[PDB]
Paper text:
Three-dimensional classification of these two-polymerase complex particles yielded three distinct 3D EM maps, designated as states 1, 2, and 3, with overall resolutions of 3.57 Å, 3.7 Å, and 3.74 Å, respectively. Notably, particle distribution shows nearly equivalent populations with bound DNA entering the right polymerase (state 1; 54%) compared to those with DNA entering the left polymerase (states 2 and 3 combined; 46%). In both states 1 and 2, the DNA substrate remains displaced from the polymerization active site in either polymerase, with the primer 3′ terminus positioned 16 Å away from the catalytic residue Asp-620 and the finger domain maintaining an open conformation. In state 1, the left polymerase thumb is elevated 10 Å higher than its right counterpart while the left polymerase thumb residues Lys-797 and Phe-796 bind the duplex DNA. Concurrently, the right polymerase thumb establishes DNA contacts through residues Asn-783, Asp-784, Lys-787, Tyr-788, Lys-797, and Phe-800, which engage the DNA minor groove, while Arg-704 contacts the DNA backbone. The primer 3′-terminus remains excluded from both polymerization and exonuclease active sites of the right polymerase.
The T4 replication system centers on a holoenzyme complex that is assembled from the DNA polymerase (gp43) and the sliding clamp (gp45) loaded onto a primer/template junction by the clamp loader complex (gp44/62) in the presence of ATP. The sliding clamp plays a crucial role by encircling the DNA double helix and anchoring the polymerase to the template. The T4 gp45 sliding clamp forms a trimeric ring structure, with each of the three monomers composed of structurally similar N-terminal and C-terminal domains (NTD and CTD).
Author numbering:
A (entry chain A): 623 to 898
B (entry chain D), C (entry chain E), D (entry chain B): 1 to 228
E (entry chain C): 761 to 829
DNA sequence: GCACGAATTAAGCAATTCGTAATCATGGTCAT
DNA sequence: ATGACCATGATTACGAATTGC
């Protein structure tokens, strides 16, 4: 993938009339100018070591371009083999609509809920095609909407083993794991209430709690898929409203992408415009 | 140079805005936050002999306050700062000019859209309740026809739904309605009377707290909404 | 509703007793520990006009301390706590009474097996020396016709032999032989001349504590011996 | 025992020097550091009638502070320390004399090879600025005919050549040039006017700080270069 | 000890250089910079390698007499 | 790796480096 | 006025990973 923004700047963006003009220019530029250069610069390889014959081919597999007129980034890298591109033409097949193409991003990992991944992919679509105000307003819209889903789907799941290693009357032990602390607090919460006890080896779903919760601890854990008793169902829902957990799930990857995209999601207002 | 106790107090208050500052030669002392959220200016009777990039303002002022008031501050032979008492001297290193984030040009805060006045005890009460009510956000608004103050807790209510705290700043004369949103972390005022000059444009704007000793300039959060 | 300095200080003591509290309309205020070992009652100088449940008492104490005393405390529009003076206004949510624990009714404590008087200075000396010496147990008994109090730490002295404090309460008249064990994790009071009324029949009993404005009750440990 | 407030402060200084001290009979007290790099003594105005070894003193100081200054402290009948106030009786554990580090006989300080007079304010300023300038040793020496103290950070200069803070004492009338060195960690004197007595024969050397209240002796170091 | 400290600085730096074997010249570091937990020696290896970019000296071969200072 | 094969030895860690927490000294500001 | 309490470096410890014999 070679960046060809300099040539587009040289010719001029404003002279076009529709995005199809942009893609057509980027298409015929490879065939008229780039492709014969490829042929000659690989024939020079064939001549250099005086090999048998020239067989390499190279044609425009994909053209990535931002939407015409939009502020959109139009594609960005993150590291070795983690990119994102608003591909418009793949193998000489014009796309009537933008075709998103991503690899290696954190949008498909199983540890996150489906809504989280859908929001991440929509943020990708914005940061690629739409402008900054779009990614800015979508961040806060999804922040408002994100607490308005079920608690179990959002909360992650961990495997708890060797509970007796890290318990002292339910309090945290020496480097007590998150799931262990949560399950100890849960056992302290419903001791003698008749629910099935949580033992080692069982996959247990875990979520934190805000500071000052009545349980006295910042965690909760119970068997995955299963539903915790209704008596403690209310407060645990109220004491996790608008929590910070999605900073550990969705805001961190969004920052990791946007920073490499030359943009920031939450507008950091300051006095910089007064200084200049 | 000669440094007086009031100047040292102003310097100590300025140290909370940023760890290091640049004492350019002249009468106008001034600094900015490392993140640019706030800027501070002051004019003091004592003049500054030369520019120094002091790094640990807290440590520098701590060692300075332990000697006599009329101690003389001048340049050492290696480029550091020498503070001599009547019978002793201390050699405090001066860091490179680059490592200190300083405002390159004093800010000429222009005419503001609105003006108002706040009493000394109001800031004390506001800071104390923010420490107690865990208030995270302050809102300068107009309610009932009076300019008033509202307190919020973004940590929980991200939509500023619950007005944890209210304060009636004073009388309002005009039709422009606004909600200036400011952070608590960037509110580093010192106790005393203050004159608020507020200006908004587009999605941004500024508020200047003018005081009898020092003045501060603070930016607005994105949630601030203006209506002229 | 109005509150004074003494009322706020004793409310602070009550917060040391228990986090939450119940406010019945009137003058007469109760609280008890979560485990219920100790109870405390006070009649405020003011008059209460509403019934409310309080979760975070210490924050309320801080707020009421920092605000002017002329501020009025009442029920907000949403049935929460509203503290508003002529200048500001503070809204604090009221927790659900189910989550908090409050006493059912005051304990009359009709009979008193033993009666003694303890001065403020001696009480403070006992408190400070217990904090210094790590004393978590007091044994109140009578030896040679003298009511005395001895310090004991059951962690190191389960046999109650090593005596670290000798607090002679005074003179005793009678042949009743009693020795009562009390754990330091309960009682919390302001320095003042105080009265103690111990009572224990069989395995059940308590000690009432009479003060000039407020009273407490502490459940005596079952291991206390009584021959009346 | 009848320990005055000045005596309590003196034993507080000794406690900073060493956790455990012994009260030999009479009106004299002394101690040494655990590592044996600092000695102290004092000719107190209070009488002592017997010897006693105490492992901890800060808690003992707090306990003495709780009770009046006129409380009588003696050897308890159970091999411990008994304190009797007008009302209170306090038991303190007694430690074995061999379990406490302390000298044998008071130090006979040899003839003062050098004499200087360090004032209260200068010494106290040095102590306060020690933490500010991250100094760990100080060299007392001769510069242009004046006895001076210069603070050096051993961490960033093993050769002790980088001046950071210099203080002067007064004219030295002699040609016996020398460059002593003192470990700052051993400066544990009460703030007051002290007399600097320097002795050094060959490798052996010491310094003595005599205040109006007590006396301290600090040990020189092998890196000190002296010649008389 | 005093004599050795006296003669420790004045001597040639090679005879005090901690010379070790370069085993994993690229396993730990991400890209030049020591990305993941980096062994004391590998950090210096990459430091010198990034210092001589275009200096005309042969870069490190694994197992060389690379000395870590 | 097809088709087995026919004989067989390296063990278990000492030490470093890093990250994260847990505990502990120490200062800034406040009710007093 | 004096420590109280909260926040911020030092210091210790142990899991985790890796290579050294």
């Amino acid at each position: 993938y070679v960046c060809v923004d300099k040539v587009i700047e040289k010719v001029g963006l404003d002279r076009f009339k529709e995005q199809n003009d942009l893609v057509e220019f980027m298409n015929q530029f490879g065939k008229k100018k780039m492709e014969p250069m490829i042929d000659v610069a690989y024939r020079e390889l064939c001549d250099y070591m005086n090999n048998r014959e020239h067989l390499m081919h190279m044609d425009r597999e994909a053209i990535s371009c931002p939407p015409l007129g939009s502020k959109g980034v139009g594609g960005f890298w993150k590291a070795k083999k983690r990119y994102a591109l608003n591909v418009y033409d793949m193998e000489d097949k014009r796309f009537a609509e933008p075709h998103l193409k991503i690899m290696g991003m954190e949008t498909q990992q199983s540890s996150t809920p489906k809504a989280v991944q859908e929001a991440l992919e929509e943020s990708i679509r914005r940061i690629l095609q739409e402008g900054e105000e779009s990614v800015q307003e979508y961040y806060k819209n999804f922040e408002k909407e994100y607490r308005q889903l079920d608690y179990k789907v959002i909360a992650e799941v961990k495997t708890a083993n060797d509970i007796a290693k890290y318990d002292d009357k339910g309090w945290p032990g020496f480097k007590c794991p998150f799931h262990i602390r949560g399950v100890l607090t849960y056992r302290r919460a419903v001791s003698g209430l008749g629910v099935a006890p949580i033992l080692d080896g069982n996959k247990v779903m875990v979520l934190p709690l805000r500071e000052g919760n009545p349980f006295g601890d910042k965690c909760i854990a119970w068997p995955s898929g299963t539903e915790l008793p209704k008596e403690i169902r209310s407060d645990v829902l109220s004491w996790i409203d608008h929590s910070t957990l999605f900073q550990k799930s969705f805001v961190k990857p969004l920052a990791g992408m946007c920073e490499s995209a030359g943009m920031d999601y939450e507008e950091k207002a300051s006095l910089d415009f007064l200084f200049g | 140079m000669k440094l007086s106790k009031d100047t040292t107090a102003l310097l100590k208050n300025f140290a909370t805005i940023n760890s290091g500052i640049m004492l350019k030669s002249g009468q106008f002392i001034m600094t900015r936050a490392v993140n640019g959220t706030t800027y501070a200016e002051a004019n003091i009777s004592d003049v500054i002999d030369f520019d120094v990039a002091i790094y640990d303002l807290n440590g520098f002022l701590g060692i300075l306050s332990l000697v006599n008031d009329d101690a003389e501050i001048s340049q050492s032979e290696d480029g550091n700062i020498k503070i001599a008492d009547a019978r002793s001297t201390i050699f405090w290193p001066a860091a490179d000019p680059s490592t200190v984030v300083a405002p390159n040009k004093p800010i000429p805060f222009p005419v503001a859209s609105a003006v108002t006045e706040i009493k000394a005890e109001d800031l004390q009460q506001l800071l104390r309740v923010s420490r107690g009510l865990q208030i995270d956000t302050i809102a300068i608004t107009v309610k009932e026809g009076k300019i008033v103050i509202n307190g919020f807790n973004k940590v929980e209510d991200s939509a500023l739904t619950r007005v944890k705290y209210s304060l009636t700043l004073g009388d309002y004369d005009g039709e422009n309605t606004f909600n200036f949103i400011i952070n608590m972390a960037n509110m580093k005022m010192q106790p005393g009377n203050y004159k608020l000059l507020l200006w908004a444009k587009g999605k941004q704007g500024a508020a200047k707290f003018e005081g009898e000793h020092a003045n501060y300039v603070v930016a607005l959060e994105a949630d601030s909404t203006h209506d002229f």
